[PDB]
Short mmCIF file of C-alpha atoms and ligand atoms in Angstrom, two decimals:
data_model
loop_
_atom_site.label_atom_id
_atom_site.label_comp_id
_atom_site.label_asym_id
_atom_site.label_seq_id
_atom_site.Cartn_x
_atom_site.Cartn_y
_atom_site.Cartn_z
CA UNK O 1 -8.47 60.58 14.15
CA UNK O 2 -6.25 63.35 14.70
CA UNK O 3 -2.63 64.06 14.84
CA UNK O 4 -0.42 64.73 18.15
CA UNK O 5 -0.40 68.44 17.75
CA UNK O 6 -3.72 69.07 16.66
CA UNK O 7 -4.89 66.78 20.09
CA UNK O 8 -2.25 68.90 21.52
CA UNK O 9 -4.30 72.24 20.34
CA UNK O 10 -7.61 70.74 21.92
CA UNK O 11 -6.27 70.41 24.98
CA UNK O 12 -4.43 74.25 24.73
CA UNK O 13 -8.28 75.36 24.09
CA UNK O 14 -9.82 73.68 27.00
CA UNK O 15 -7.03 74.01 29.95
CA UNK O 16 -6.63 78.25 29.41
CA UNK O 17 -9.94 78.82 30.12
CA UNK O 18 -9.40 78.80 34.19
CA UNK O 19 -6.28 78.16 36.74
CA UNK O 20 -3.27 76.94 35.19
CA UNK O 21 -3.52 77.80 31.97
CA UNK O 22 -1.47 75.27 30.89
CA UNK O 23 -3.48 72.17 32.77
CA UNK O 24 -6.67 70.68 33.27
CA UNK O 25 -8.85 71.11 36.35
CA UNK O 26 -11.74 68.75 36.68
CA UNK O 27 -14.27 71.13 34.97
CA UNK O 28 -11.75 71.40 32.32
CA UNK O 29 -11.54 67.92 31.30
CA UNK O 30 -15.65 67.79 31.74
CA UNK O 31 -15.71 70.14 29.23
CA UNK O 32 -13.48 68.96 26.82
CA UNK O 33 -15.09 65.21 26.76
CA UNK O 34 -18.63 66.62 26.80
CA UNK O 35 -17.60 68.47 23.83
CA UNK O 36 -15.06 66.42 21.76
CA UNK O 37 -14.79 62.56 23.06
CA UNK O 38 -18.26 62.15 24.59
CA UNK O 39 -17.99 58.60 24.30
CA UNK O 40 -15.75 58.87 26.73
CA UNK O 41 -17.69 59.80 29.69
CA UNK O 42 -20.51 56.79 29.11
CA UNK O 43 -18.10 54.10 30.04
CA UNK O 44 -17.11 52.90 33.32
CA UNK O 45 -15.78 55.18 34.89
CA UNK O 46 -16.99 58.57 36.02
CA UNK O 47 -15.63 61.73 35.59
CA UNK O 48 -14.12 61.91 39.33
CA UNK O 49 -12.21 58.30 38.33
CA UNK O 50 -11.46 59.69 35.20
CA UNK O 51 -10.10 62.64 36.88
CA UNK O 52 -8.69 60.74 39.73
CA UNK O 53 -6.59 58.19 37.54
CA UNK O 54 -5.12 60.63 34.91
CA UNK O 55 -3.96 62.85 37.45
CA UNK O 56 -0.86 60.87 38.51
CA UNK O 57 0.98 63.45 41.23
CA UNK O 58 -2.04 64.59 42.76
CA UNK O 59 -1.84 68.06 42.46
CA UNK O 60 -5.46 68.16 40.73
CA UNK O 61 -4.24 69.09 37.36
CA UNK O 62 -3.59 66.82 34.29
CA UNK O 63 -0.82 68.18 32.20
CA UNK O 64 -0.70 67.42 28.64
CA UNK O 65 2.13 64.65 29.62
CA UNK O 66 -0.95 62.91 32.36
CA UNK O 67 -3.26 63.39 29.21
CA UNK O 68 -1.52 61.17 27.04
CA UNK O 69 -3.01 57.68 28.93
CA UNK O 70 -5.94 58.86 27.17
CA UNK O 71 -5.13 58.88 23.61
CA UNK O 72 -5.70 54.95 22.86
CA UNK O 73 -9.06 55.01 24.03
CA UNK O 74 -9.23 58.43 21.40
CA UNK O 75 -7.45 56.73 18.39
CA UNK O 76 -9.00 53.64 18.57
CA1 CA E 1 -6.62 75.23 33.34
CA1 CA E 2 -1.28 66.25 37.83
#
């Protein structure tokens, strides 16, 4: 639906606005799937899995690398 950097631009937009500039804190990704992939937050999980299973090193930030498990669910 859209290519690698433009997803890559998204995320830019959505993990500057607070903390790390260059992650995602929870509110962060909220924001971001409320806004572009709502679908994304109706399914199964909620956004505290969500959260909890993209951020791999538990440092509560998902780096554009963490992000990445979620582009199948995106493209497909
Ligand atoms: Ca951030
Ligand atoms: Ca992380």
């Amino acid at each position: 639906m859209k290519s690698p950097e433009e997803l890559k631009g998204i995320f830019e937009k959505y993990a500057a606005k607070e903390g790390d500039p260059n992650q995602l804190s929870k509110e962060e990704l909220k924001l971001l799937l409320q806004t572009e992939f709502p679908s994304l937050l109706k399914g199964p999980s909620t956004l505290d899995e969500l959260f909890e299973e993209l951020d791999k090193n538990g440092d509560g930030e998902v780096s554009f690398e963490e992000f990445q498990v979620l582009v199948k669910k995106i493209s497909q």
